Design an enzyme around this catalytic site. Structure first.
Site, short mmCIF file in Angstrom:
data_model
loop_
_atom_site.label_atom_id
_atom_site.label_comp_id
_atom_site.label_asym_id
_atom_site.label_seq_id
_atom_site.Cartn_x
_atom_site.Cartn_y
_atom_site.Cartn_z
N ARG A 227 0.86 -1.18 0.00
CA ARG A 227 0.00 0.00 0.00
C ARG A 227 0.90 1.22 0.00
NH1 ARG A 227 -2.71 4.78 2.06
NH2 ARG A 227 -1.09 4.57 3.63
N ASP A 229 1.71 4.93 0.35
CA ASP A 229 1.16 6.12 0.98
C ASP A 229 1.46 7.36 0.14
OD1 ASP A 229 0.22 7.78 3.41
OD2 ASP A 229 2.30 8.47 3.21
N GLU A 258 -2.79 5.36 -2.23
CA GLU A 258 -3.86 6.20 -1.70
C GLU A 258 -3.80 7.54 -2.41
OE1 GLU A 258 -4.16 8.45 1.62
OE2 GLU A 258 -2.04 8.56 2.17
N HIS A 328 -8.36 4.59 8.35
CA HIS A 328 -7.72 5.30 9.45
C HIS A 328 -7.69 6.83 9.27
CE1 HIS A 328 -4.92 4.89 6.29
NE2 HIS A 328 -3.81 5.10 6.98
N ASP A 329 -8.21 7.37 8.16
CA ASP A 329 -8.29 8.82 7.99
C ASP A 329 -9.71 9.36 7.91
OD1 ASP A 329 -5.37 9.17 7.80
OD2 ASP A 329 -5.58 8.33 5.78
#
Ligand SMILES: [Ca+2]
Ligand SMILES: [Ca+2]
Ligand SMILES: [Ca+2]
Ligand SMILES: [Ca+2]
Length: 687
Positions: A227, A229, A258, A328-329
């Site tokens: 993943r 970032d 993301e 988580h955001d």
């Protein structure tokens, strides 16, 4: 091994991912717990370390909590060594509990475990047919002030413990020194710091080599996916070169980034990154719309279908979208005081939809909390009895057993403001999903059509969400029924395919000599042909062959986008996987710069050249529009481009706009690209 095997690291659409914030999940080893002001024993300050670690994840696999759900991949906090200093941010002590404040990408964060703990996590997961995905954040190190070295750890960067450099004394040029971004333009957010995070300079040879080395270490230990970032804040060209080196290495794996999108937002650059970078994306357009429809009720089922159709047409690789309903955001899906059926229906929809579903830890325990860090509380319970747990248990394994859900098309069969009925189809298998978000009224369903063959189908959820059995007649006609208030049901049929059918090809981009994986149904037991466009790959070029998976070597064929197809050993052809992008060779990243190229409002400089990576002289495939604000200033323009290593490029620059296409005069520019790493070329415009 088949397409569904844990060994299949490059294709994930048969999986369901469970996203764990490591420090907040399970403390399986109190001896690695940080001490002092870095630890919150009573969990009052959610910015400190709570104690969750890899041992705790290992325990929740062994004792069956995570296996009981049908989850088949785990996505964990960045595993690498972070700064160990406590930072005061407006009065509140803060730590690296989240794993995003790196200082050594080749060591572990000792709070989570040591390297033996990490190898054990990998081993326990694979032994349970669970893949492991890591967060990877190569954009930055950690908080730093260039003019005040004493703050935090000055964003320092170590290589296996040896200091390559820090922010304040950066003679090697390891970092950008361009200030902080105001998020006003994409260019502004790439070449400047995110808040106080020391931004890495990936146009540095030592930094390109460092991250290629560091990711290979983690992939060497068996990591199955990455993943990335903040992919919006790194050069597209460097990322394309970076993931091409993974796909050409010994460990090709699924990768996805993301790229945040707000509600009711679509973005051309987001779309272009998903389609051209060779990396996939978290599906924010899907996530925001599902939140609007089920959690906030600010959109209807009709609006949701419109987004399903518009994402399908704009993204070339829709089975690679990583879908979710929170993370988580964002604020937790569960809202204090609402019922739990919104969570349950959103899960059911996501678990049966196209792409790669991901579940945020604690969703199945109805955890609440608005904003960061309230949305990162300690896992509240391991109750395997919640309806949401059982919804995931029932439906996640369908992605492994029904190829319509893992690979199939998406077709609406019924839609009003409260009800959505969607069918997934792949050859002879199909699945029909019905959802009624209205909590006080049932709806009669009459005249519904499907691809299900005639007979009686029970709800896969067995009525857990008030679903029902259906009776299907001759032409896929579904006998009249009533979909209960809050009702949700799944009906399915799977049949052995007889014709060869491709569901996915991974990775989506590659240079000749890379090994790609082709997943589907009915390829036969014995080797046939794989067709990169019109060119055949047989014999030596097929690594392995079986009924649901083929592994094959990309052949030396004209670079560019092409269809991929297979013919069985009995000469039978397949459907074609669209837009596989063949590269010319291994990639390097080159910064191209052109000076004295003035333009009027609405006209942009682009790069064209001979290699496919440079568009092959098509101004329609030109690279750009180039940048002219940060790294170099108008009338200078620059752009970071993935180009083939060790290659004589011929190129010119152009000026395009609302209609006009102005070309560069004179003869061509010429440049031999590096054999490895990164490079730069600076050119004068030619009138
Ligand atoms: Ca611990
Ligand atoms: Ca078990
Ligand atoms: Ca950056
Ligand atoms: Ca809206």
């Amino acid at each position: 091994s088949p397409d569904t095997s844990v060994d299949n690291k490059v294709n994930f659409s048969t999986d369901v991912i469970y996203q764990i914030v490591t420090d907040r999940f399970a403390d399986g080893d109190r001896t690695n717990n940080p001490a002092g002001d870095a630890f919150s024993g009573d969990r009052s300050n959610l910015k400190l370390y709570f104690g969750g670690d890899w041992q705790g994840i290992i325990d929740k696999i062994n004792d069956g909590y995570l296996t009981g759900m049908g989850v088949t991949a785990l996505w964990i906090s960045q595993p690498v060594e972070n700064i160990t200093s406590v930072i005061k941010y407006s009065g509140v002590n803060n730590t690296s509990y989240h794993g995003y404040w790196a200082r050594d990408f080749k060591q572990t964060n000792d709070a989570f475990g040591d390297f033996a703990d990490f190898q054990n996590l990998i081993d326990t997961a694979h032994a349970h047919n669970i893949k492991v995905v890591i967060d990877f954040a190569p954009n930055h190190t950690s908080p730093a002030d260039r003019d005040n070295p004493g703050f935090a750890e000055n964003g320092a960067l170590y290589d296996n413990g040896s200091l390559l450099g820090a922010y304040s004394n950066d003679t090697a040029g390891l970092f950008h020194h361009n200030g902080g971004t105001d998020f006003s333009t994409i260019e502004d957010g790439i070449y400047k710091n995110l808040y106080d995070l020391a931004d890495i300079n990936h146009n540095n040879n030592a930094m390109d080599a460092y991250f290629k080395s560091a990711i290979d270490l983690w992939l060497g230990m068996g990591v199955d996916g990455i993943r990335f970032d903040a992919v919006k804040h790194m050069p597209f060209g460097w990322q394309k070169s970076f993931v091409s080196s993974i796909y050409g290495g010994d460990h090709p794996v699924f990768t996805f980034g993301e790229w945040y999108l707000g509600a009711d937002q679509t973005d051309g650059d987001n779309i272009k990154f998903a389609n051209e970078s060779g990396m996939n994306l978290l599906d924010f357009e899907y996530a925001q719309e599902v939140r609007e429809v089920f959690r906030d009720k600010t959109e209807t089922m009709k609006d949701l279908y419109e987004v399903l159709a518009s994402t399908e047409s704009q993204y070339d690789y829709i089975n690679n979208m990583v879908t979710f309903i929170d993370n988580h955001d964002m604020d937790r899906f569960q809202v204090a005081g609402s019922g739990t059926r919104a969570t349950e229906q959103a899960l059911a929809l996501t678990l049966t939809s196209r792409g790669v579903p991901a579940i945020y830890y604690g969703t199945e325990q109805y955890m609440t909390g608005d904003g960061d860090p309230n949305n990162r509380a300690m896992m509240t319970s391991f109750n395997t009895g919640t309806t949401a747990y059982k919804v995931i248990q029932a439906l996640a394994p369908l992605r492994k057993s029904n190829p319509a859900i893992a690979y199939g098309t998406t077709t609406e069969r019924w839609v009003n403001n409260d009800v959505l009925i969607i069918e997934r189809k792949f050859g002879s298998s199909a699945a029909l999903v019905a959802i009624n978000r209205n909590s006080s009224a049932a709806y009669p369903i009459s005249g519904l059509l499907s691809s299900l063959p005639a007979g009686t189908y029970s709800d896969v959820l067995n009525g857990l969400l008030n679903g029902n059995s259906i009776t299907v007649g001759s032409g896929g006609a579904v006998t009249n029924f009533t979909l209960a208030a809050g009702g949700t049901a799944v009906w399915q049929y799977t049949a052995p395919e007889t014709s060869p059918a491709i569901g996915n090809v991974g990775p989506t981009m590659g240079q000749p000599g890379n090994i790609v994986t082709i997943d589907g149904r009915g390829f036969g037991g014995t080797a046939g042909t794989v067709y990169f466009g019109t060119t055949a790959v047989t014999g030596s070029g097929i690594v392995s062959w079986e009924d649901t998976q083929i592994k094959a070597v990309i052949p030396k064929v004209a670079a560019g986008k092409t269809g991929v197809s297979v013919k069985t050993s009995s000469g039978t052809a397949s459907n074609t996987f669209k837009s596989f992008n063949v590269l010319t060779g291994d990639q390097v990243t080159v910064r191209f710069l052109v000076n004295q190229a003035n333009t009027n409002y609405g006209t942009d400089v682009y790069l064209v050249g001979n290699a496919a990576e440079l568009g092959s002289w098509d101004p329609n495939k030109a690279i750009g529009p180039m940048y002219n604000q940060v790294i170099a200033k108008y009338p200078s323009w620059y752009y970071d481009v993935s180009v083939p290593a060790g290659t004589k490029l011929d190129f010119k620059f152009i000026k395009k706009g609302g209609g006009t296409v102005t070309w560069e005069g004179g003869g061509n520019h010429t440049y031999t690209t590096p054999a490895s790493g990164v490079g730069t070329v600076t050119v004068d415009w030619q009138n």
